[PDB]
Amino acid sequence: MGLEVMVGKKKGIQGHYNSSYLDSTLFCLFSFSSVLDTVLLRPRSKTDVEYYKETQELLRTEIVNPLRIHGYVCATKIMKLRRILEKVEAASGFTSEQKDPEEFLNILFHHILRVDPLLRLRSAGQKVQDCYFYQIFMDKVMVPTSQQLLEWSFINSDLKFAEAPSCLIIQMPRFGKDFKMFNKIFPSLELDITDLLDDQQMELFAVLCIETSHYVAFVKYGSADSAWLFFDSMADRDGGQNGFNIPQVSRCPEVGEYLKMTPEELHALDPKNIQGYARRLLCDAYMCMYQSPTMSLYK
Amino acid sequence: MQIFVKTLTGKTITLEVEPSDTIENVKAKIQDKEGIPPDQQRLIFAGKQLEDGRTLSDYNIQKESTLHLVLRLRGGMQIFVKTLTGKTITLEVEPSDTIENVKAKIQDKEGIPPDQQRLIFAGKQLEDGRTLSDYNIQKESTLHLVLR
């Protein structure tokens, strides 16, 4: 096991038939982070629902372990997951259609595994609502940090964290395929949630991106500024009908360099002058994912 | 009673509704009002995504309440356009994209003008006014690009 097993052509989760929403979110969530590892480990309890075990076993044993030891997962295994998904929610295109990661997270975490809600929020002084991720919503600076968006979205609905989340997935402010509130967003490397708690820090570990119809992923695999990878479950294709896709994972240290710059410096930079894969991280963010700090060394 | 539904795009949409109506119901009104299909709609109140089977009552939504609307952002694939030398370029598209605007995406990515682009699929040359869906391209697929 090692970084270099993860990197290359024919690495990551092989996409197949509109699967990129699923491939990329699983890659974000499990390629390097362990924030949700327990979800793959909690024993079946009597309150668990029908496919609990088959699903857990599939994720751990045929998806995540191979991803982590071999650097690669065949589309057949994802397709097995998608069928289970479709059996839990029929006629919702889980085996063939473009979907939202939100849809995927909710069926998987809420219905099948029965993950305790990741976020507990109180529209302040009211009582708590449960969710798995947070939607930035607010009224239209040109390049905001995700720190600002979270603060602004919280103030806009008078919200607070009921308790400190371990895994905070934040959805960027977009309205369909055709509208982005912001042309570029600065994904804060660290989030300070102190002034948003009822009663401190979190570290960026992934960004799930999409320009209009294909999801890809950026992942932070170490504390170093340059320790970023990019994953496309459909980087290349072989064949025609019975053709198959070739996923790719690539080092993208430039991301680290652009995130040493300020929002206003990035704002002045034309997206066509942004190098490597960094353009997509800065312009196409869909979800930013934060965890209880494990990679960092406090100083 | 009246409620307000604010889009992320800045438009506020006002709706006549009753305290016990379902989230399904509200969505249908929004469709009729703005043409957004209900399966794309995500309604939020107080940071809480509102579930289809429950009522306004159930989320304590009342007189003059404002809701947030955001749209699902579906995705999954990328088509491939290959040259004969074996070089590949990828594009994000919908089934409903015209061949014209697929070429326009190629003009935007690489330099090439659409007048000089011959796009081929299943041995057939692709005509500008048709869509990808006309040619049964419904997921990641391979087109050939030949130059004129």
From TrEMBL, chain A:
<comment type="subunit">
    <text>Interacts (via CAP-Gly domain) with IKBKG/NEMO (via proline-rich C-terminal region). Interacts with TRAF2 and TRIP. Interacts with PLK1, DVL1, DVL3, MAVS, TBK1, IKKE and RIGI. Interacts (via CAP-Gly domain) with microtubules. Interacts with HDAC6 and BCL3. Interacts with MAP3K7. Identified in a complex with TRAF6 and SQSTM1. Interacts with OPTN and SQSTM1. Interacts with CEP350. Interacts with RNF31; the interaction is indirect and is mediated via SPATA2.</text>
</comment>
<protein>
    <recommendedName>
        <fullName>Ubiquitin carboxyl-terminal hydrolase CYLD</fullName>
    </recommendedName>
</protein>
<feature type="domain" description="USP">
    <location>
        <begin position="11"/>
        <end position="293"/>
    </location>
</feature>
<comment type="similarity">
    <text>Belongs to the peptidase C19 family.</text>
</comment>
